[PDB]
Design a protein around this ligand. Structure first.
Ligand code: NH4
Ligand code: NH4
Length: 115
C-alpha cells in the first residue's frame, strides 16, 4: 500500500479529509478522477503532467476513484476521467472525458481573470 513515485507537480489524494483540506485552500485546484479500468484516463496522463508544469499557481490533484469512492459519491462523478476545478471550497467548472485541451483552456481562462 506504500510507495513514492517521483512526480514533481501532481499530488495524489489519499482520503476525503485530505481532498476537503486541499479544495478548501485559497488556491485554484484541479482534481482529476481516474481509475485503473479506464482507457481514456491513460490519454490524459502526460497532458496532465505538462499542464501541471505549465500552470504552477494551480494544484493538480489525482483522485483514484477505486480507492476513494466516497469522494466520487460526494461530487457525483459518473464518468472517468473527470476534472473538477475548485477554489476556496467552491466548484468553478468541470471537464468530463479525455479532453486535455478543453481543460487547459478552462484553467487558462480562469487564471486570466484572476490577474
Ligand atoms: N477530464
Ligand atoms: N468541490
Amino acid at each position: 500500500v506504500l510507495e513514492e513515485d517521483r512526480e514533481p507537480d501532481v499530488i495524489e489524494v489519499n482520503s476525503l479529509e485530505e481532498f476537503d483540506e486541499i479544495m478548501s485552500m485559497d488556491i485554484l485546484t484541479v482534481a482529476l478522477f481516474w481509475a485503473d479500468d479506464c482507457g481514456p484516463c491513460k490519454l490524459i496522463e502526460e497532458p496532465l503532467r505538462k499542464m501541471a508544469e505549465e500552470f504552477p499557481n494551480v494544484v493538480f490533484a489525482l483522485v483514484d476513484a477505486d480507492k476513494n469512492p466516497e469522494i466520487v459519491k460526494k461530487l457525483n462523478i459518473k464518468s472517468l476521467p473527470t476534472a473538477v476545478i475548485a477554489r476556496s471550497g467552491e466548484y468553478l467548472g468541470d471537464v468530463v472525458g479525455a479532453r486535455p485541451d478543453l481543460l487547459r483552456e478552462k484553467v487558462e481562462n480562469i487564471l486570466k481573470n484572476l490577474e
